[model samples]
Target chain A: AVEERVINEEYKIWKKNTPFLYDLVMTHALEWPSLTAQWLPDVTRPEGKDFSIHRLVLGTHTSDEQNHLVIASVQLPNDDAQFDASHYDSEKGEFGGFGSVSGKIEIEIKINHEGEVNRARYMPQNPCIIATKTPSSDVLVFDYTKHPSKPDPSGECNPDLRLRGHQKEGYGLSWNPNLSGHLLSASDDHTICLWDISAVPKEGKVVDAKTIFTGHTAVVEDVSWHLLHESLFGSVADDQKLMIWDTRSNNTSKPSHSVDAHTAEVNCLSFNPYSEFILATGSADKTVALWDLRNLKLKLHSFESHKDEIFQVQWSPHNETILASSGTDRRLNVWDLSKIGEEQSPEDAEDGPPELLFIHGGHTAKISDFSWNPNEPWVICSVSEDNIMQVWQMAENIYND
Target chain B: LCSQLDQLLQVPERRKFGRMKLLQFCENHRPAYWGTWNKKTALIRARDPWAQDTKLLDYEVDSDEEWEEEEPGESLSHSEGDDDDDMGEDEDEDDGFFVPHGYLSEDEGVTEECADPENHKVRQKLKAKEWDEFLAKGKRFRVLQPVKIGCVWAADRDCAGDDLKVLQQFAACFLE
Candidate 1:
């Protein structure tokens, strides 16, 4: 009876009129990046299939005068390879042949010609659109074309769409995986603005979202859409809170569920692609809290190990139990939650403090961010405050470590 | 004494062979983390080398072999905890760990260049009393301090996962 009332003639009218709802219902779950996907048009750089980070790209934020959009990608190695974390001793400057990290380049083009780029992401489908965020509160979309095999100037780096909305500096930004032209941007003004470019022009300002999400009480640091939910996304802020907001609601002022996640500022958050309910949030309290969306009242696991404020927490696309984190301490830690359950049987209060399967100290600066290649299992490419991006191969069997 | 014997059993060389002291156990003090880290920044220090260099705890005196207190740097003792305790001040408490700068001597471990405690970054969330109690109960709890201790094979240089397992086992035995 509920389905009959919700799915009848009125549904047709809503589908015809409300395009966002229509797109949300019609679209399937977003596809995670394919490991066998083509990198540069015809050139599958790593020729032979291997499981390690092969290349790195660094963005040079030279001066206040130049634009700061950085772009880089890496090829990763096999997950169960010989690399192990306990072996990497940074003190005596030692890493017992974890894996080879090779091939690094600064993207050929100046991604942002003017302001410091706060965020950027490569679109899912190609002719890829690399979206960039500027402190000026505008997102610049650059178009990269898969060639007809030729040496072209401007290098397929043509201005695509210029989106403007936020009243202040823009920080957190991500493109909708399933929706082709829909983008999400969070800003310091405590507002998250959505943009639709379905009706946008090729060159100039096409169109923008008029309704801004004001659910956050402080400067919103990050915003991400749920992979499985039709109208769900999450946001974290300096207010030490994380909120789940549903886009289907006409009322954007309040979130569906909000929780005080940490004692200090919550810096970054990400959803598990494999499981919709599992969410991860990093904070200044030197811990990463994992949440099961089923009940937001209490955390599933509070992984405390970082020595400084954690800046990024991401789940491995291949494994459900594994995740990676980077922070101001410049440490990259990988956790295998499979053992955590067996190890922490409520009966024992301490189980040797959530053993990190691996600890990598490959960079000198505060690691600003890091990403696991969707194609490769444990391979990682991270960006740092030192204006350098380093690609490192991780240990294969976390359990063995 | 039980903790010391447990350390020797889990020692890299012994564990690697299933028994062999010929290969020294490389004990790491910091938590086993895999990522890029700052080289100059100091890791948490421990007064005793339980976390790193457990061989120091292998014998209190006149072991007739591998390690001795009256070395090149400075003569020390198992009861040398007094001097390290005296070295502690209010400033080291700011980072949320009780082990002060220069808490471990050069011979006990790789002594990092001690930075002035006044210049240390203040951790706003943690209080001095809390960290003191936490470190004091290091045996009852795994002190969440990132210090390095452990070893690799002298031949292939394969990192010993068994060594880290042993380190945690003994560290927990004491903390518990």
Candidate 2:
């Protein structure tokens, strides 16, 4: 009870200062916690409206209940209306009552899932085509446009296509941005499977993997396609290794370059969309490492702000140097690569690294997943295992310089 | 968390009882719950010959205390000797260092031992030494947090009425 109250107290403090700390902040409670969260690229602004509609994908992780893949739509105030100086009380350090500039998040669609969704991602080129990793060794693909908004009462719906090959279930699923309908999945079977989904039949079908990459000796936790190179991709594994693979290579089984990336299991990796040569990885060692693809053997820099196992790291879609990482410590830290080696003021140095832009310390449990908003820079949506989802954008002054 | 592969091997011996009688005993006395059967096949695919033998007996025992009810009288006979036997073989293979079950499992509760400052310092030194040795040998080591399940009500319940009202207005924007 004491610990619970302490966490609640901390949350109240963060909430009380939301006006000064954030340009926009919104939170919602879900019936079941979701382990994966991703934003759809499309944004809708009604004719001459101040609010824009955005959508995101989330999957249910209920234990005994029927699981689901949900597409949720949120309406947020436009940039010009998000901030108001009158909302803040400078003397008391509190935000005034909420007004018209808030946001809303509601479910748009829920499709029945066979099991808990370990991870979910949409095809970058076609946001309506989604793929999910389950407790089984198969990757389930669904076309959101075809599924009904409400799930059937029978609870026995099948996916449009199934990609099968892995001997063990996995959590890693990635869709190629450059190559439409190309997908990559990594598994605990110590293999990564590449699938060509463009030719999948309209009728439900089970498809075999096009290529199986085998180099990691332990559970492959995550895989990422190169932002610019259609044939190149990367995989991180529990073996503490990061292997870069290229389909163009003569030997399809081996990666082009393999590097021991961390002292512990590498949980996730992200390729910088703006800078093709830059990649970032999060690990169980409580640090995020940045690597230069040109010099695969050496790391460019390591950010050591997290105090627990890092779960997800993602580069901002709108900024070249900005990225965010969430971890078991219940922190979602936004970082700037350009701040590397920059000098910090004496008072500020005591807080943390200069590159650490902001820390969203709102969640009281481990953050299962988080995603950057493709339509709005600095805006992000994060979901925790505690059944809380938060959409927030830091105050401009925090990152303006 | 410890590898489920390691967990497959660490399961204690099953009770030697007749099949029909065992089923009857489980139906009446055992809890009506078992974890997902998915791990069994995954372990089988990994070439663990004992996987099939242990599949039916794999129950999710959250605590050592819960093992008491299921095992009943077997505890007095097996607690000291069986546990030692389980640890002895793995300890010899893992060098002289004996890692506790909680240590390998990465349970956050294990950190409660750090309440003793002296013990915390000793543990820090031991962890540092182990990490150095693994790095020197270019071997992988596990350092993950155990998966947290279930919901935390305090965190969820603190969403405040004002926030919900704003969320409703946001929903209003969608309907309009």
Candidate 3:
């Protein structure tokens, strides 16, 4: 008991004096990050590197996300830098030459508007449109393909259309996977809107919302559409609830199922890539929860390892239960749910906690967005307040199948 | 002429037998040069520039509209001026090195060429500097293109060559 009082005395002194230095040493000493520095192995080297990535703080895009992976320098300007060059030239080293000179930072990207972008998604069905959520109640649509090269020479970089309906800041964006013309967006307005891009022709300019979803009293944090079913989708709100909606039903005004899944706000949601009935959501309560559409009320599993708010979560399109989560804690956790309790009973891994497969921590700020490459199973793209987009390729042993 | 013709005729393995038969027939029959005389098949041997008044047999007359509509090829046209219009004009501080040494692919990220208007303008300035540094001090850029058989003449300058001088002298002597 006297030793405990002496430890408290030492802890109080560290907090009172030398706070920054003490925090720095304590931060590194406690969370000895495993894969932070080694993830981008060659960001500091230059010569004999194959294709240099051009770091333009210019532009989401799921189809075009590959192009936005920023490195630096421009010996040759080519957008094909995003076109799976690792498959073409696997013998490259590092990136540290063209963009940087001595110690001065030359490139700076300002989000044309303010309030950090909480959501940006490239339309899966449309190669032309990329949807971005503004800090306010606005959704900006950038049509990179709207102006073809020959006839139209104006390189339009700003949003081609501004969709306004929600009264508050936009929190999430999701394009319909099966259809090109439809889009779903959730906002702080506590309402979700269905937008029709097909109504806007090449000659026509802007578009407004066609349908709006209501019922949540608080902020609707995120929304995601079902992979196989075109009309089915789910949304999570600040009311500590997860609501599933169907557009085809006779009474399309309200959600079919709404469950109070967490004590805090549900910030993000993702539909399982393979399983049509499974979905996952992350909450501000520092837990990553999983649920089955088969049984809406029953919680299958909850991962409570995170220290702070859980902001974003996603499933790997390539693996079964392999997934990733990140939030205010500044740590990205990759969990394989199928290996949860292998030691207890090798075959029955679904009983307890999730298997902590990998922890990726590099961002100084909270990471907001992430996407798995539909074509390349092992590749992923993530973005953060660090004002950078990173494309991470998994090691062969990690995704061995 | 016969030796030159023999040298020019490239007989491939596929056509060796037919070429051998033609050579043997020509050797046996010392006939006069047949200029578009055979009835079933007609071949013309007139000088290339001697065709205005002479009528041709195997060609269809299509209007320019039809030509434009049916032209299914690369739609982009390069340098709108006539082929020889800008032959020796290099005083603009940026000219001559028109032969394309490199090409930009469709997906190659936008270069100054089509990236942005300002980028294109900056490239235009840099291109002038590049031309001023690389151009020959006093000589004009000259290109020799073959317009017809046995003639590879300079397109722009009228500088007479030693070989052409001999050919001109021979033509004069044959008439004299």
Candidate 4:
């Protein structure tokens, strides 16, 4: 009790007194941080860093920001969006931005931070489009290396090569966890393509392998591979089908396991790292089901929380007992597998629903993506039609506090 | 010293894992004074040439850090300037060093370590004085690059020999 009180006292004091001091210490702290400072410095130019009134390139984004160039920046909580243009001095090297108050904006992002945004760089007013023809019904790569470079290459640019067949519907894109210069992207065009990062002109060919597999009729939304497998991957399309492709062969003829898995398009799918064969997929059907890859038909256990379509279901890295799902329902149900589904073991529902964490204020807008940092899993990032890309913190009730 | 290709290798591995700030450098970067004109036309322009402000006390401001300053990059064409325009005619000022990472990425952090003497809050204040005194005769700012492929040509420029080996090591270690 004495130790607890004394520790609490110090915590209170430290929390109460150190803002500027902590900031200064962090600026020079030698050790890499876990929770607070995940943002590693890639490089620095001759710029002064300050969270001033922030900055805008002096205008709003046009049509080009979408389609190919993703123009997304997180609004700093401390920022004053209404600050006058005069007060917004460009002389100060800070960045600020506002969303276009029009259209049904769908932002695709790759953030690697906490709070409002990560990888917050302003994209050009009109970034070049990715591709037009669409490559082999098999997916193609979405790399920024194809652009000619007699010139300076910066930001989200580089000519996009749409290898025809990679159609108009929704597609899935995920980076390789095992390899540095590799990528895996899936598209409704009904194919998954593996790309080599060095595909730039200085380098050689853009594509290393193009694998096509299909059992579904409708458009495919997302795909993910076993994090360790370079030759094996999976895809889910509009037909409410899930098919695994062994890239060694080109045809959709033989899948490791093809199942009529959900009621609607599999919005997203994730495989538990610790349990590689164990897969979990969320669907527009408003239910998240975790399947035993060994026997996918083993009666899918559902994570039923909302009355609407679920946009994404992500398996947490730290624990398989935990999974996150978000959709038009505007709710993120952190399902504890230890309690529900096949792992539920009768005690799951009894232990009560594994904490329903609602985010995006559980509004009506449709969400595009949700990612929990593979490195720091507790902090969740999600993007929505609200024209707002927000972040949420799920504490162990006592932990975040 | 490694070739220009090697400069890409020294960059820290991952930025998302760190407080990432990428430096997109080029072989042509020169070490000189830069600033902007036609304030609105530039990315960032110097509002008051005389007034200088820095995070560090007593630090004098440098001539340029505005978005409008440094030219849009030699790699891309400055399209609008007609043929008769004599805007960038002075060949001397546009000498050796190439500006790396472009202007948007050139802004400094609160306690930035890779100090840009031109803009280092404290260093800025002392720059003009140093130039008027020590460099009025044109002193070469020691090139502080991660790679040194071209250092051999500068070996005879006063202790350029000593600088050669340093540049050579930096090039090997950082070249991709």
Predicted structure with the largest DockQ when compared to the true one: 4
Displacement of residue A13 (Cα, Å) in model 4 is 32
Compared with the true structure, what per-residue lDDT tens digits does model 2 show for residues A139-212?
Answer: 89887788888787987766888889888789999989888788899888878898998887777489988888
DockQ (Cα-based) for each candidate? 0.01, 0.01, 0.01, 0.02
Task: Give residue A295's error in model 3 in angstroms.
Answer: 0.6
Give per-residue lDDT, candidate 3, residue A312: 81
Best-matching candidate per TM-score: 2
Off by over 4 Å in 4: A1-68, A71-169, A179-183, A190-209, A249-251, A318-320, A341-364, A375-377, A395-401, B1-176
Evaluated on chain B only, what is the TM-score of candidate 2? 0.16
lDDT of 4 by residue, A1-401 (tens): 88657544543332222211111111101111111111111212222322221111101112332122232222211112112121122543322112222111112232111111111111112122222112224322322333332222344333333233344433465554454444456565555555554344544434445445455566666766566555556666678887766555556556666788777767678877666566778777777776765566764577667678776777676665667777775445566554332433343333234443322232224544555544333545555443333344332221221
Can you write out model 3's per-residue Cα lDDT over A297-386, one digit (the tens) per residue? 789888876777888888887786788888876556778876765665532233223366554444445665555555434445555554
Local distance difference test scores for all models: 0.53, 0.73, 0.52, 0.41
Candidates 1 and 4 compared by TM-score, better number: 1
- Report the error of model 2 at residue B24, Å: 54
Worst 10 residues of 4 chain A by lDDT: A22-31
Over the true interface residues, superposed, what is the Cα RMSD of model 4?
A: 22.9
- How accurately is candidate 3 docked according to DockQ? 0.01
lDDT of 1 by residue, A314-389 (tens): 8887788888888876567778777675555432323235445555553445666677756534445666664444
